[PDB]
Amino acid sequence: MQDAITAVINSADVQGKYLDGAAMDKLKSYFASGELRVRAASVISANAATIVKEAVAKSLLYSDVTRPGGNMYTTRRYAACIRDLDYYLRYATYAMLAGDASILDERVLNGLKETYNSLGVPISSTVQAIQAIKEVTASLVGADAGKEMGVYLDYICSGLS
Amino acid sequence: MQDAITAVINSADVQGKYLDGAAMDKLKSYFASGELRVRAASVISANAATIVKEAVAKSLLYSDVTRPGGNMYTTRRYAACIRDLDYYLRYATYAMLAGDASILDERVLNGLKETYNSLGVPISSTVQAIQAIKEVTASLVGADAGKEMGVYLDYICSGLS
Amino acid sequence: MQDAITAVINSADVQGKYLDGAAMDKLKSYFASGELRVRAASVISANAATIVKEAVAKSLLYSDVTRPGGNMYTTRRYAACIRDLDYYLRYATYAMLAGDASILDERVLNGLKETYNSLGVPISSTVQAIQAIKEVTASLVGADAGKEMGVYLDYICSGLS
Amino acid sequence: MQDAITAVINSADVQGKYLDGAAMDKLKSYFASGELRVRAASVISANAATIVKEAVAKSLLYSDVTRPGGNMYTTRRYAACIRDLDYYLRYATYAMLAGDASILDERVLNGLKETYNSLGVPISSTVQAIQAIKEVTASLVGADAGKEMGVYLDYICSGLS
Amino acid sequence: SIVTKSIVNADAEARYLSPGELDRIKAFVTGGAARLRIAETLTGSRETIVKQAGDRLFQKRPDIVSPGGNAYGEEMTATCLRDMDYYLRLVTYGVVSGDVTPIEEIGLVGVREMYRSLGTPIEAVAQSVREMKEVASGLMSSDDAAEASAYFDFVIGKMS
Amino acid sequence: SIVTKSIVNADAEARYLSPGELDRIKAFVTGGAARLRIAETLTGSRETIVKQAGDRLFQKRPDIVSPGGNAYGEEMTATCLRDMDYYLRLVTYGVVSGDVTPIEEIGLVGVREMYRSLGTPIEAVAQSVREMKEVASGLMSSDDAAEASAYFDFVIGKMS
Amino acid sequence: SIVTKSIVNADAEARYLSPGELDRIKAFVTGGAARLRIAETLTGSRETIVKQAGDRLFQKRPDIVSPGGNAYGEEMTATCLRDMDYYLRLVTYGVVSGDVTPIEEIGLVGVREMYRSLGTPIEAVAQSVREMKEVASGLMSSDDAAEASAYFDFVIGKMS
Amino acid sequence: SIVTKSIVNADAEARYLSPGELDRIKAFVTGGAARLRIAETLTGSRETIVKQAGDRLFQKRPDIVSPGGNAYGEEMTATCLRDMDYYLRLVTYGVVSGDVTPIEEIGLVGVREMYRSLGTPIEAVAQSVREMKEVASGLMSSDDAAEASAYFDFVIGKMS
Amino acid sequence: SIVTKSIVNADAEARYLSPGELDRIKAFVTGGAARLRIAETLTGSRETIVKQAGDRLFQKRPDIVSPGGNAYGEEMTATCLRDMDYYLRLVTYGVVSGDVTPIEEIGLVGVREMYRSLGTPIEAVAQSVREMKEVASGLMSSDDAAEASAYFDFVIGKMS
Amino acid sequence: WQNEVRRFIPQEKKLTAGNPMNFLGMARSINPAANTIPKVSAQNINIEASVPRR
Amino acid sequence: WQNEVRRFIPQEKKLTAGNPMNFLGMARSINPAANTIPKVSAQNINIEASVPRR
Ligand SMILES: *[C@@H](C)[C@H]1/C(=C/c2[nH]c(/C=C3N=C(/C=C4\NC(=O)C(CC)=C4C)C(C)=C\3CCC(=O)O)c(CCC(=O)O)c2C)NC(=O)[C@@H]1C
Ligand SMILES: *[C@@H](C)[C@H]1/C(=C/c2[nH]c(/C=C3N=C(/C=C4\NC(=O)C(CC)=C4C)C(C)=C\3CCC(=O)O)c(CCC(=O)O)c2C)NC(=O)[C@@H]1C
Ligand SMILES: *[C@H](C)[C@H]1/C(=C/c2[nH]c(/C=C3N=C(/C=C4\NC(=O)C(CC)=C4C)C(C)=C\3CCC(=O)O)c(CCC(=O)O)c2C)NC(=O)[C@@H]1C
Ligand SMILES: *[C@H](C)[C@H]1/C(=C/c2[nH]c(/C=C3N=C(/C=C4\NC(=O)C(CC)=C4C)C(C)=C\3CCC(=O)O)c(CCC(=O)O)c2C)NC(=O)[C@@H]1C
Ligand SMILES: *[C@H](C)[C@H]1/C(=C/c2[nH]c(/C=C3N=C(/C=C4\NC(=O)C(CC)=C4C)C(C)=C\3CCC(=O)O)c(CCC(=O)O)c2C)NC(=O)[C@@H]1C
Ligand SMILES: *[C@H](C)[C@H]1/C(=C/c2[nH]c(/C=C3N=C(/C=C4\NC(=O)C(CC)=C4C)C(C)=C\3CCC(=O)O)c(CCC(=O)O)c2C)NC(=O)[C@@H]1C
Ligand SMILES: *[C@H](C)[C@H]1/C(=C/c2[nH]c(/C=C3N=C(/C=C4\NC(=O)C(CC)=C4C)C(C)=C\3CCC(=O)O)c(CCC(=O)O)c2C)NC(=O)[C@@H]1C
Ligand SMILES: *[C@H](C)[C@H]1/C(=C/c2[nH]c(/C=C3N=C(/C=C4\NC(=O)C(CC)=C4C)C(C)=C\3CCC(=O)O)c(CCC(=O)O)c2C)NC(=O)[C@@H]1C
Ligand SMILES: *[C@H](C)[C@H]1/C(=C/c2[nH]c(/C=C3N=C(/C=C4\NC(=O)C(CC)=C4C)C(C)=C\3CCC(=O)O)c(CCC(=O)O)c2C)NC(=O)[C@@H]1C
Ligand SMILES: CC1=C(/C=C/C(C)=C/C=C/C(C)=C/C=C/C=C(C)/C=C/C=C(C)/C=C/C2=C(C)C(=O)CCC2(C)C)C(C)(C)CCC1=O
Ligand SMILES: CC1=C(/C=C/C(C)=C/C=C/C(C)=C/C=C/C=C(C)/C=C/C=C(C)/C=C/C2=C(C)C(=O)CCC2(C)C)C(C)(C)CCC1=O
């Protein structure tokens, strides 16, 4: 993967030149983002299990998904989906801290659609769940940091679907 | 595609044997059921639109599917869903009249799940709509003809699930 | 994998209901067939090497596959055929004992088609060998008990088709 | 497909609401773009054959690409390359005048990589062709119009690769 | 969007936009300010507009709420009003977009199938949309009245 | 199932089922009448068995029903009733199949993860299953009680 | 006519009207006495049947005769009676002919267009035809009732 | 004419003209005064426009009138002047019509085949129409310069 | 210690420290005064924070101290308070060290296993440590609150 | 001592866009004037001149 | 004449096996006895001997 700083460095290195103001301004922008992103990461790592818990409780919990027949049925499948959401939250925080979504594609969306298709996972149900984590994390962290977390989670959902 | 008579004939041909006692009994059973199937098909042809209308009203109205966000929103999608239900009813009637599900297998089920996944439509909602069509048809036709239609409708639901 | 009992249990569990009269009846049918299944399984286990011996003798020996340059040339490859036929017989016996041909799908047919296509193994020749195995085992265990073995070997052949 | 205007319209409609302030400012931004996009489209329609001509003359022309072995050899393949460039330029103009890449990724990226691979097309040479298209368009449309055109052509290149 | 409309029409012939299409895009992009203004002027009066239109339609065609009627019940009266609200949102979308494409793609295509399935009278719903247009023209500016009445007229004629 | 378990063991060893395994399958299929009777009895007394077990659980561990506990409201008590119904059904499935693989595959692997996600006390869940075992033993014959109690004890031990 | 339909099918397949159709024509021509008798029965009782059919239809859908509705005016009701008379005469024609070809060639093709141009609730017309069928079935005897009901519910389905 | 183009589109869709077409025709009819002004200016200054553009084209491509060329000889240069006159009048027609239909119909369809038959360098003709574009823009107003430039751009692209 | 973590990472890389690691060491050695001050404040006030947090957790989860619970009983409440004091001391250790390594090595590795053996609601334990962090933040400076909350919150997440 | 009880049934959902609940109250306010039941015999109508001869 | 007024609410879907709706009535019938609210403030306990030492 690569953070926003590394993206700027790569764009400069492609031309093999030094960083100019057209990259200086974006570096300042990312640095100003900075403490906001790190605080959001801190709070998410704080209540890491909690967002997953309430998101599953609001989207999939007490529904046909967790009922027999639904793919959330059986404790094994339940733990599997919870582990998947732990993946999604950890990688979303990773992308937010880095400032770039490259980690999702290089780590998350790479083959995930096909593997869920092979497993017969409900893509729409997973998308709804991840959206639940998105809004729950937004409410837990605030407006701005919630917005970055939401955009990363929505990129995850778009790639998944 | 093959009705009961053609299915029996093709099975006997594939074994390379004449129509024995079992095949004759099956053909006689179909002949006995022929008048029932004809009357049921006539009734369903008379009340085809009303059946779909009532099933949709009692199963798929005033819910999230009808509301925006649901895949039945807009006149286009609602008409597509209504036409899907009409297709299900007509092909189930065809299968009932022919005494075999090969017509459904080759004209309905093949690719149905794939297209439904591609377009994101609610398979569960479609199954419930098929259920409601089943009760309406059973009420209109009677008990035994209702069960004969319902077995094929449930086969459609099982294939689509 | 799955068997008759596991098939009934999963059929009940998909809708989450307990076991009704129909499920108990199916289990009783399987228990009734259990004596025949155990008899055939023990006989086939005792005579496994022989069965493949006569199947190869009456299906493949003295032919293009065995001739030099043939896929069954090169004694390592002949032993590979013997082992593969033994695998087919053993897993067909597994399916016969279980009453369900899911072990064949998830433990024999899984990647076997691709294996043979990449290896240049004559699929039709293997199918003929399996048919000879079916005839030999049917003659060895009778017509009734041989019927199930033929059904499962036919399942293997159709999957390999 | 869709553009910015239809994007705001259907984003509102999916939630089933009227135009909120965010939609109003998005529409105002698109209208402000407006005449700039229409002027760029008019100049491109003026010199339609020009940009492709000098883009080829800059990047592909007089090279191993147009030499034997290279995919540009023979007048048939040369004119096929020119036709591909004309497709790419018209889609770029459409996407520019619309404000979204939906037209491209619905009319370009669908199976294009796989079809070019089936034809053994040089993806790098194609990307260079679109690049030369970008500079030739910029030199005739200006700075910001050329920049947005280059952004669309770069999206085309990313989809191609 | 007239943008996507002319884009599709040009792509049908596999060519860039004609002078007429580009000129109309010029006019639309220039008048987008007035278009959005009419957007607010119609999106602000939604409750009163639908209330007045439905109320007038009820005595225009009392059969809609008459016994054994399509919307005799209170619930069906409210449902008819909610359809009025949907169609007003669609016309707002169309007026803002400058093209009837949002109207067609949302609430016109297959609508005859919809209302034959539900038994509702297409002529009655057209009269309802006409009442909406009349109230909107009354409650908005003159030029904005004509601009919005163009799309109200389109939806009324197409659905009817 | 016992058949599936023996088949899996034989496949792991790359051999046909041994005569002892065939004898076990034969004995199971012969004695299947008793297992079907036990499953019938449990399914019949499903309502009362679960009600008595859940009630005795509630006065045995009132914390779960206490404020702050996991199942405080009547709705959460209903969720416990559904969970205990699930585990009773799984025990019946194990009884009919003659082996614990269906139970383990349905509701034993990852049960700790599920109850940690839900906040549920797995020890209290094991106690609930123990109470269901006690009530079933009361409702069954001694030998039949032992045969079902094998699977109840397996579930309880895996939960704990 | 059944003979005309068979001729059309045989011509489409380039056939000679196979015995499977010749025997049907023979049976129809032999049994034509009953069809004729049903024809005179319906012709004689056309007035009464239409009257109770209109009564039942107005009872079920009073709005259509309401001033909002299409049938209001004492002459729109007369026109409904007239259209029911046409449909009854058409059904008599179909019964005497043996097939639904005169039915569809007289009053089913474009009936939706006609009733849309007239504003009529075609579904209400279908309900009226259903009432006519029920009245005729009550007036006639069993098998004759089913024989007429074939054409009746054919027209019902086509109208719907 | 854009009116004819809109009518063609509407008749193809089997519908009355949409608000976009109505606004387009309204804008055209309101701008007809400026369009006629541009047409009158082009007609008045045709000969100077064509001569200056032809001389600029000669300077761009001297080989066109060089010995052995298509325009070589005073006859074959006067024929270029005549062709430039034809295309300028065609542009006037297109400007006064508002659409490119007359241009495409009289000078664009079959033009490549005609110039292949006559041996003319259509690329040179495109350069000539470009030069006519700059000359007319110089002789013409700035605000209408963009409008005339749109049609010149269309012709240059098509005949290129 | 943060220096221990940096040296471990450098050894794993099989070379000397990186500029980032040396920067971390320099910043930590500079801020050690503030860190030690925070640690001393928490150590001095420890009984207050632990006591208030325990009471607050008792109000939040009355089930913990209700009859039939792990914390129910005077000695059980004392044991839980001892656990609270141990974890506060561990957080002080983490604050002084600069890294969560001592926290994990002392009271987070296998804590799930130990509390499963003891039958304890580790989620309630996480709530207790949350209350400890809240009380410490309340009775500590705003600047110091960030550093203290970081380590308290790591503990909360690890044992949540 | 808040001790909030955790409910699994989805509570009464707020009236989202398009819900007829959102318009039921204002439909009440409109209060449509339902037409009275007409009194038409549909049995004494001599259908030979009541049908218009236009 | 009866003219059954169709209502806003969609027809309720039947309960399935896994739903707790079919167990709400059973839970109500059981009516578990909630534990009395605790009164332990803990302010009177010192962590020196209250913690057991065996
Ligand atoms: C007498 C010398 C001994 C003997 C030999 C024997 N062999 C067969 C049949 C076969 N022998 C082979 C062997 C090979 N195939 C290979 O690719 C290789 C690599 C060189 C070898 C060694 C095979 C494949 C067959 C059967 C297939 C075929 O023949 O095409 C027989 C006939 C047995 C039968 O039932 O047909 C015999 C007699 N047998 C003895 O008892 C002697 C010790
Ligand atoms: C009170 C709100 C919470 C709670 C706490 C609780 N803990 C115990 C018992 C023990 N806790 C520990 C843990 C540790 N001991 C150590 O030395 C360390 C190393 C850092 C730790 C983490 C241990 C070992 C015990 C057992 C006794 C012992 O220390 O030797 C109890 C009582 C358990 C009992 O039955 O004695 C309680 C109540 N329990 C809750 O429910 C709350 C979340
Ligand atoms: C949860 C949102 C939905 C759901 C899904 C579900 N997932 C599985 C199984 C797996 N999920 C994954 C996914 C990943 N592994 C990775 O490494 C990554 C990125 C780090 C991802 C996204 C994998 C690999 C598996 C299979 C292996 C495993 O279990 O870990 C299941 C069960 C599949 C099965 O039965 O074999 C399910 C059901 N289920 C729902 O109900 C949600 C909508
Ligand atoms: C209605 C109960 C549900 C529903 C339906 C719905 N379906 C589509 C689109 C398609 N459905 C099919 C399926 C078939 N077409 C056939 O001819 C047959 C053969 C028997 C089948 C099974 C197909 C092919 C499509 C796509 C093509 C089409 O034009 O219909 C839609 C619209 C999807 C879209 O994006 O347009 C809808 C709405 N949707 C629901 O929510 C109901 C539960
Ligand atoms: C000479 C008789 C005429 C003429 C020639 C001319 N050609 C070019 C440039 C190119 N010509 C080709 C043609 C081919 N390449 C192939 O592989 C094939 C089949 C084997 C053909 C027909 C190509 C590809 C080029 C581009 C350069 C290249 O080959 O890499 C030019 C120069 C064009 C420019 O702008 O550089 C010229 C002048 N011109 C005349 O007027 C003569 C009648
Ligand atoms: C030229 C720019 C580069 C190049 C490419 C190349 N393309 C072809 C052949 C085809 N290209 C396409 C692509 C499209 N057709 C479409 O309609 C669309 C979107 C509008 C696309 C992207 C297709 C379909 C073909 C084959 C059919 C045809 O001839 O039209 C070739 C020739 C391949 C051959 O085997 O003959 C080549 C060489 N190669 C280069 O070097 C350029 C960088
Ligand atoms: C009111 C002016 C007229 C009228 C309306 C009426 N409509 C219904 C029921 C429905 N109308 C629709 C239509 C749409 N729903 C959408 O989401 C959109 C797309 C944007 C449209 C066009 C639908 C789907 C229904 C049924 C389901 C639902 O309400 O969501 C009724 C009641 C029908 C019933 O039997 O329940 C009525 C009365 N009726 C008139 O007489 C007026 C002319
Ligand atoms: C009751 C005495 C104990 C208890 C139970 C409890 N469970 C839930 C919620 C759920 N339980 C499950 C469990 C399963 N699903 C399965 O498919 C299987 C069998 C294969 C099991 C074991 C699930 C999935 C849920 C979530 C809801 C759903 O059923 O879909 C609750 C409520 C949790 C909440 O926060 O709402 C409770 C109370 N809890 C205790 O404390 C008791 C010891
Ligand atoms: C009555 C219950 C329903 C109804 C009917 C209705 N029809 C008309 C007017 C005409 N009907 C026709 C044509 C036909 N009627 C037939 O039965 C057939 C036989 C094949 C045909 C072709 C025509 C042409 C007219 C008008 C001219 C004429 O009568 O000759 C009316 C009067 C409409 C008006 O405004 O004049 C009515 C009432 N309408 C309903 O609403 C009922 C559901
Ligand atoms: C016998 C005899 C006689 C002798 C008589 C004789 C033998 C007389 C001989 C007469 C002859 C053969 C004269 C030749 C004239 C040719 C000219 C001017 C060439 C023109 C071509 C041009 C300009 C080319 C133009 C070209 C250009 C550049 C283009 O752009 C297009 C191509 C093209 C090629 C057309 C006498 C009469 C003297 C009397 C005594 C006596 O004994
Ligand atoms: C709440 C809770 C719990 C706590 C539970 C608790 C508190 C349980 C405690 C229950 C108590 C207090 C039980 C005491 C029973 C006394 C008996 C049987 C004595 C009978 C005497 C006899 C017959 C003598 C008779 C006599 C004889 C014969 C004579 O000879 C003459 C004299 C005499 C009269 C004496 C648990 C620990 C379970 C779990 C955790 C938790 O939270």
CA–CA separation, B28 vs B22, rounded Å?
10
- For chain D, how many residues are written? 161
Amino acid occupying residue C124? S
From chain D, pick out residues whose CB is under 8 angstroms from the CB of B69.
14-16
Chains B and I touch (3+ CB pairs under 8 A): no
Q: What tokens does B127 get?
A: 């199954």
CB B133 within 8 A of CB B88: yes
Is the CB of B120 inside 8 Å of chain D's CB atoms? no
CB E117 within 8 A of CB B53: yes
Tell which CATH classification among 3.40.50.300, 1.10.490.20, 2.60.120.380, 1.20.120.530 matches the domain C1-161.
1.10.490.20
Query: How many Å lie between the alpha carbon of B17 and the closest alpha carbon of chain K?
Result: 47
Closest-CA distance of chain H to residue D43, Å? 7
In chain J, the residue whose alpha carbon lies closest to the alpha carbon of D13 is J17
**Close Cβ partners of F59 (under 8 Å, ≥ 6 residues apart):** K32, K33
In Å, the largest CA–CA distance within chain G is: 57
CA B54, B57, B59, B65 torsion-angle sign: positive
Alpha-carbon distance I77 to I58, whole Å? 10
Pocket test for ligand 4, best of B113, B114, B119, B152 (most atoms within 8 A of CB): B119
Chains D and G touch (3+ CB pairs under 8 A): no
Instruction: Round to whole Å and give the CA distance between A147 and A29.
Output: 16
Of F60, F68, F121, the CB nearest to I62: F68
Distances (CA, A) of E109 to B79, E92, E104: 8, 17, 6
* CB of D149 shorter than 6 A to ligand 6: no
Mutate to test the interface with F, among J1, J2, J5, J11 (most CBs of F within 10 A): J5
Crossing angle of helices E122-139 and E74-97, in 10° steps, is 60
Which residue CA neighbors atom 4 of ligand 9 most closely?
G80
CB atoms within 10 A of CB A56: 23
Cα–Cα separations (whole angstroms), residue I2 to D28, I29, I95, I101, I155: 53, 10, 11, 8, 17
Evaluate whether chains G and C are touching (3 or more beta carbon pairs less than 8 Å apart): no
Distance, in Å, from the CA atom of K12 to the CA atom of K9, rounded to the nearest integer, reads 8
In this structure, the number of other CB atoms found within 10 A of the CB of residue E43 comes to 19
CA B106 to chain centre: 13
Candidates F50, F83, F131: which one to mutate for ligand 8, based on the most atoms within 8 Å of Cβ?
F83
C16 CB neighbours in chain K (<8 A) are: 16-18
Residues 6+ apart with CB under 8 A from C32: none
Cβ-contact A157, A150 below 8 angstroms: no
Rounded distance, CA A117 to CA A115, Å? 5
Q: Tell me the sheet residues that pair with B68.
A: B70
- Determine the Cα–Cα distance for residues G103 and G110; give it in Å rounded to an integer: 12
Q: How far is CA A70 from CA A60, A82, A87, G53, K18, in A?
A: 10, 15, 21, 51, 10
- CA–CA separation, E25 vs E10, rounded Å? 13
Cβ of C68 under 8 Å from any chain A Cβ?
no
Q: Which of F55, F67, F82 is opposite residue K23, by nearest beta carbon?
A: F82
Mark yes or no for CB contact A61/J9 under 8 Å.
no
Q: State the smallest CA–CA distance between residue K34 and chain I in angstroms.
A: 10
Angstrom resolution of this structure: 2.6
Mutate to test the interface with D, among E8, E9, E17, E28 (most CBs of D within 10 A): E17
Report CB contact under 8 Å: B69, D16.
yes
Q: d(Cα A92, Cα A152) in Å, to the nearest integer?
A: 6
Residues of F in contact with K21 (CB under 8 A): 78
Whole-angstrom distance, CA of residue E24 vs CA of residue E33: 15
Hey, are the CB atoms on J40 and G77 less than 8 Å from each other? yes
Q: Domain locations in chain D? A: 1-161
By C-alpha distance, which of D73, D67, D88 is closest to D132?
D88
Query: Amino acid identity, residue H86?
Result: Y
CB atoms inside a 10 Å sphere around CB A129: 25
B chain contacts of residue D110, beta-carbon cutoff 8 Å: none
Q: What is the DSSP letter of F17?
A: P
Q: Nearest-CA neighbor of E80 among E72, E89, E91?
A: E72
Q: How far is the CA of G77 from the centre of ligand 9 (A)?
A: 9
Subunits with 3+ Cβ pairs within 8 Å of H are D, E
Phi-psi region of C19 (alpha: psi -120 to 50; beta: other; left: phi over 0): beta
- Block residue for tokens 């009456």: C58
Give I64→chain F minimum CA distance, Å.
8
Task: Compute CA distances B125 → A94, B130, B138, I20, whole Å.
Answer: 37, 9, 20, 56
3-state secondary structure chain I: CHHHHHHHHHHHHCCCCCHHHHHHHHHHHHHHHHHHHHHHHHHHCHHHHHHHHHHHHHHHCHHHCCCCCCCCCHHHHHHHHHHHHHHHHHHHHHHHHCCCHHHHHHHHCCHHHHHHHCCCCHHHHHHHHHHHHHHHHHCCCHHHHHHHHHHHHHHHHHCC
Instruction: Say if ligand 2 is within 6 A of residue I80 CB.
Output: yes
Which method was used?
Answer: cryo-EM
SS3 sequence of chain C: CCCHHHHHHHHHHHCCCCCCHHHHHHHHHHHHHHHHHHHHHHHHHHCHHHHHHHHHHHHCCCCCCCCCCCCCCCHHHHHHHHHHHHHHHHHHHHHHHHCCCCHHHHHCCCCHHHHHHHHCCCHHHHHHHHHHHHHHHHHHHCHHHHHHHHHHHHHHHHHHC
CA-CA-CA-CA torsion sign (A13, A19, A25, A31) = positive
Q: Which residue of K has its CA nearest to A62?
A: K19
Check E157 against H16: CB less than 8 A apart: yes
Per the rule left: phi > 0, alpha: psi between -120 and 50, beta: everything else, J34 is: beta
The Cα B47–Cα G160 span in angstroms is 8
Nearest atom within ligand 3 for CA of residue A66 = 41
**Ligand 9 pocket, residue G40 CB under 6 Å:** no
Report the distance separating Cα B93 and Cα B85, nearest Å.
12
Nearest ligand 7 atom to the CA of B74 is 19
**Rounded to an integer, what distance in angstroms lies between the CA atom of residue H84 and that of residue H79?**
9
State which amino acid sits at residue D62.
Y
Neighbours of H69 (CB within 10 A): 18
Determine the Cα–Cα distance for residues A137 and A145; give it in Å rounded to an integer.
9
CB I91 less than 6 A from any atom of ligand 2: no
**Which residues in I lie closer than 8 A to residue F68 (C-beta atoms)?**
60-64, 66
Calpha distance H76→H57 (Å, rounded): 14
Q: Which of A76, A121, A126 has most ligand 3 atoms within 8 Å of CB, for mutation? A: A121
Ligand nearest to the CA of C74: 1
DSSP letter for each residue of B82-118: HHHHHHHHHHHHHHHHHT-SHHHIIIIITTHHHHHHH
Q: Rounded to the nearest 5°, which phi and psi values hold at B70?
A: -70, 150
Q: What's the sign of the alpha-carbon dihedral C96, C98, C100, C103?
A: negative
Q: Roughly how many angstroms between the first and final C-alpha of chain C, as a whole number?
A: 22
Q: Which residues pair with B70 in a beta bridge?
A: B68
Residues 6+ away with beta carbon under 8 Å from G115: G121, G122, G125
* Cα separation, H153 vs H71, whole angstroms: 24
Residue I117 contacts J, CB cutoff 8 Å? no
Name the minimum distance, in Å, from the CA of A61 to any CA of chain C.
17
Whether E72 and J25 have beta carbons less than 8 Å apart is answered as no
Residues K45, I73 contacting (CB under 8 angstroms) = no
Dihedral sign for Cα A139, A142, A147, A152, please.
negative
